[PDB]
Every structure is written in structure tokens, then in C-alpha cells.
Design a protein around this ligand. Structure first.
Ligand SMILES: [K+]
Ligand SMILES: [K+]
Lengths: 344, 344
């Protein structure tokens, strides 16, 4: 089939993992990515080649290009973990061949042919054919945050306590979880760095919104922990903020780490709390959850698309042309609230 | 029945928890305990009054008298969590009355009438009538370390990996676990602070004994972790040593904290390991294990006594008279290896 043999893409400058980590802020793209023209890859037997319409930018992409994620970089490959597009070619396996022509939300995973390119490669199994009436803009961010929100909110529900805690309260993921929580009568306790994010987070359903920069934050924190008694803490930040939250939480608290936005030392302030107050510390990784809960993967994908299809969920501060991404994605990422997309 | 109305005891000077914690070393007894003559307590309906023959000294007692344990001090009460003795009186409940006259191993728990006294109070349920042919010296230390060893070694067995890690390798508890491990073909990896403790720990069955003070400790540590691939880490120390061990362990490692011998900051060096390597951090508390695994309590008590009765287990550096305990227990506790007992 007629597919271009060359494409523009945002190519990884770094290889493997970094020897000089520099936190989670994306100050510039040029140390990590270069705009280039490269050969269009060929999908393997279980893979599909997608003509990318829109690609998301998630905290996992920023960590990955910096060599600070749990997956190594392949120098010279396009970065980008997810997007939306149309499948223009597939490997010889029937799953891949049957998807050709379909518009899909996709996750590139370990393909090492990212979405920040005119064409990406994904496993057929990492694609979600979109319903004919679903929006393209809903498709580009349909996987990473929606499935993580469903999977992690399921932990909150199974624990049964109405209150739960989240750091990085203003992140797109936290906003999806806040929405789910409000529907089921759960009470999110979230932390922010800006007073201007309090009203919006309370509007979507947060019961408490605490500014971690406030002088009396720890004292306010203890009052809220006593009043609400949450057991689940979903943490994207780690460091001293998460150390303080965990320390203030009641007995049987579970500190569930799923991001490391703060590289500062993460201290277990009182290890005796794990002994005497039965506290636990664990991690959450969507790729692992999908591997271990294959039977929950299907219903979560069906629930996420149903929510986008029936209006319960609808995603966007900026759409950046791929030709402008190296120069202006960092400026757009500094804007509080909303997700940034790349348009090849 | 004729029981003295007065007794000698080592009374708590401190109340509740301390506001000035001072680590795990017992430099002196006088800040924490005073020898006194006090009224013999009366057992409550579910309790027994024990004439103490021998009382153990465990790290939990040192932490407790310092106000650094997970149970508050009651000023003026005798300290001491366990011992052996004869029941001379019981509360009116049949369990307590049926134990009168029996020689028992006992745990005082929350009775607030400790074993470092001529008479202690324990729940009837916290007593183990000793077999008529069992030694008194085996009875005084039959509960805390043997039941913790059984319960924690069960975690190692259920995980199924032959290698496992323990800090404070030379402690009585670690030595009991090492013995269990050797019987079942498990491979203990333990850390010590003295080269002189290597031979003895290897003699009882440790596969690896690492001196944490060695300049190349972390490099040796990584070589051993790669070679042995343990998943369970039983930690009595916490702090930087435990932080380093956890960091070097392979995927799916469980850091099980059951003591805090090092009060220095406990850091999760790479929180990403909980995300990407599925690592967990939890606590272990024998009192909680007995509450949650009531059905395992009976077989562990029967297995511990059977091991003492049939020679598999047999406990002792010093027996200190109660009249000498304030002055000389700290000097005896500094002696590496062996347990110290108090004889009222
Ligand atoms: K590198
Ligand atoms: K106090």
C-alpha cells in the first residue's frame, strides 16, 4: 500500500537512561529532542503503523525524553507514548491486519516508534478503535490518563473509605479521578502549589484543596486527616510533601506512588507507623496493572470510551504543530491547567 | 490465697511517649527505671497474677522504657513484656482460674504490670502453660522472639524465594530465623557491624554475612543481590542501611519493617522502584499478626513449645538479679551475642 517512505518526527537525542537527572520540569526540548526527517518504520507481525492525527504530552513523556522514566530511550527514535490516528498498515497477524483503516487511540509502549511523528508504531493490542461518532480530540488522550484514573479509582473504591488523598491535584489525571469520585460520593483531598487552582478543583468535586506552600500546611493537613480519615494516598510527587502527607494519615494508610515529580529525598518520617499503624507503601504502574488484570482491561477500555461517547468525559490548553513543538512545547507546558497536544 | 501484698519491681520513670527520643542504645537504666517496693496488683477477670521466675530483656523493652515504642508508658508501673513464672492468682473468668498453679511463659501486653517485678499481670490468653518437662530458661523467652520468628519466616516461605535478607543479623530473633531457614534450605543474607559475628552467623546457617561498616559494602551488596535475588527483607534497623539494601534488591522486593534500631532518616532512594520494579514497603507487628491470624496463633505456639520440648530450640549471656538490674543491665546489653535476663 501507498504510504510515505519519509516523515517528520521529534527524535530522541538521549540514549538509555540519564546519568545527570534534572527533575520533572521541562525547561527546553533541544537537549532531549531534535526535529528530523527519517524513514517511516515498518510494523512487525503484531503491530500497526498509524498515521498520527494528534499526540498527547503526558508527564511520562517528559520523564522519558529526559531519560528519567522506567523505560530506556532509543536514540534517534521519535518519542511520544500516545495519540490518535488512522492505521495505514499492519503486520501479517490477523489482529493487526483487521485494524487497517481504523481510526484508533493508541499507546506506543515499547515499540520505540513514538507518537511525536507523522507515523507511529503500536501493538495491535495497544489500540482502541474509536466508535465512528467519537471525537478525534477525545481519542488522543483516551488511554493513559483515563485508564489510570479508572484503575486507581478502583483501588479507592475497594478500600471503601470515602476520603482519599492525591498530590499534584491540578494534573489532568487527578481531575479525571476527582470527577469519578464526585459521581460515587467519594471525597478527594488534593494538594496544589497555586491558590488560583483551589476554586477549579473544588468545582469539579474535590472536598479539600490544600496549598502545600501555605505556612500552616502541616497543621491544616493534620486537621483534615483527623476529620476525613482517608486510607488511600495516590502520589505523583513523592519527596517531602508526600512524606508529610503519609506521616499525617491514619492507621492502615496506603501510600501508592505512581509518579516522581519531586526528585528531593522521599523520607519515611516514622517507620514505626508501618509497624504499629499497619501503613503500607507501594507503586502503581498502568502497564503492570494491564498485565496483571487482563480481565479488567476490557471493561476499563469499554468504560473509558463509553464515557467519551456518552458525554460523561470530554478532554486542552494548546495544539502545537509538530514544526513548532521543539521551540514552544516548554512554554505551553508551564501554563497551569489543560493538556498540550502535538499535531503532526 | 496467701500472696505477698508488697513486691520489688523496676518502675517506669517516664509516662506516655518521649518528647526527646534518643535512639536504641541503652546507655543507663536510671533515666527510665527506678527500683522500688510497690503493692502487688490484683488481676482483672480475664487476667492472671504471675510470680515471676525469670524475665527477658528484648529490644522492644528498651524502646518501651525510653517512650520510643508503639505502646505508652504508665509511670510507676513495672516494665518488662515477657517472662516465665507460676500463676498464683487469677480473675474470676474460668480461663484465668484454670491456669492457677501452672508454670507459664507469659506476655504482659497492655496489662501495665510488667515482668520486671516479683509479680506480673498477663491476660490468661497471653500465657503458655509449659510442658512439665520444659526448662524454665526456655520459658522466659518462649514468646516474643520464637513466635515472631515463626510468623516472619512463614512470610519468607510463602514468597518461595530461597534467599532473603535481614538487618541486625546477630540479634536473637535473626538467629532463630537463620536456624529455621537452614532446616528448610533457605539462604539468609544478613548484615552485622562486627567482623567477629561473621563466623557465628555462618555457623548457624547464614548464606551471606555482610559487615555494613566495610568500605565496599554497597558494591558487595549489589553482587550478593544479583547472585541470590531475594524478595523478602526483614528489617529491624531502618535508616540508611535499610535504604541501601532495599535499593539494591531485585524486582518485587518487600521491605518488611519490624524494628527501628537506627533513628537516622529512612529514605526511599528510588521511589521509581516501587512503580517499575513492583517493590513494597510494609510493617510487621507480632501483636497484630496474632490478632489477624488467630487460626495460626495456636499452631505457632504448639510449634514453638514442641521445638523447645524436643531439643530443636534451646535459649543467654547473663542472668541479672533484679536488685542489680538498674545498675548493670546496660553493661550486659553492650556484650555482643546472647540474651540478658532479670531474676526477681
Ligand atoms: K545514557
Ligand atoms: K511523656
Amino acid at each position: 500500500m501507498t504510504i510515505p517512505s519519509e516523515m517528520k518526527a521529534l527524535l530522541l537525542v538521549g540514549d538509555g537512561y540519564t546519568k545527570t537527572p534534572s527533575g520533572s520540569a521541562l525547561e527546553a526540548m533541544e537537549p532531549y529532542l531534535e526535529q528530523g526527517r527519517i524513514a517511516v518504520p515498518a510494523p512487525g507481525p503484531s503491530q500497526v503503523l498509524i498515521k498520527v492525527n494528534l499526540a498527547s504530552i503526558n508527564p511520562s513523556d517528559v520523564a522519558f525524553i529526559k531519560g528519567q522514566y522506567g523505560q530506556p530511550r532509543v536514540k534517534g527514535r521519535p518519542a511520544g507514548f500516545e495519540g490518535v490516528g488512522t492505521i495505514v498498515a499492519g503486520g501479517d497477524e490477523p489482529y493487526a491486519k483487521s485494524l487497517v483503516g481504523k481510526r484508533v487511540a493508541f499507546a506506543t509502549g515499547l515499540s520505540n516508534w513514538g507518537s511525536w511523528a507523522e507515523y507511529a508504531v503500536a501493538e495491535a493490542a495497544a489500540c482502541i478503535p474509536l466508535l465512528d461518532t467519537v471525537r478525534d480530540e477525545d481519542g488522543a488522550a483516551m488511554i493513559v490518563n483515563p485508564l489510570t484514573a479508572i484503575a486507581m479509582f478502583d483501588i479507592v473504591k475497594q478500600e471503601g473509605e470515602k476520603a482519599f488523598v492525591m498530590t499534584a491535584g491540578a494534573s489532568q489525571l487527578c481531575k479525571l479521578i476527582i470527577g469519578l469520585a464526585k459521581e460515587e460520593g467519594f471525597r478527594p483531598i488534593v494538594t496544589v502549589r497555586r491558590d488560583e487552582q483551589i476554586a477549579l478543583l473544588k468545582d469539579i468535586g474535590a472536598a479539600h484543596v490544600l496549598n502545600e506552600k501555605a505556612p500552616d500546611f502541616e497543621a491544616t493537613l493534620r486537621e483534615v486527616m483527623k476529620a476525613e480519615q482517608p486510607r488511600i494516598f495516590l502520589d505523583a510527587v513523592t519527596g517531602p510533601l508526600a512524606s508529610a502527607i503519609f506521616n499525617a494519615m491514619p492507621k492502615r494508610a496506603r501510600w501508592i506512588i505512581y509518579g516522581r515529580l519531586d526528585p528531593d529525598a522521599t523520607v519515611i518520617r516514622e517507620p514505626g507507623q508501618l509497624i504499629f499503624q499497619h501503613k503500607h507503601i507501594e507503586g502503581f504502574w498502568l502497564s503492570e496493572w494491564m498485565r496483571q488484570f487482563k480481565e479488567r482491561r476490557g471493561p476499563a477500555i469499554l468504560e473509558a470510551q463509553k464515557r467519551f461517547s456518552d458525554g460523561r468525559w470530554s478532554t486542552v490548553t494548546a495544539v502545537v504543530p509538530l514544526a513548532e513543538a521543539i521551540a514552544w512545547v516548554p512554554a505551553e507546558l508551564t501554563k497551569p491547567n489543560g493538556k498540550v497536544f502535538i499535531r503532526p
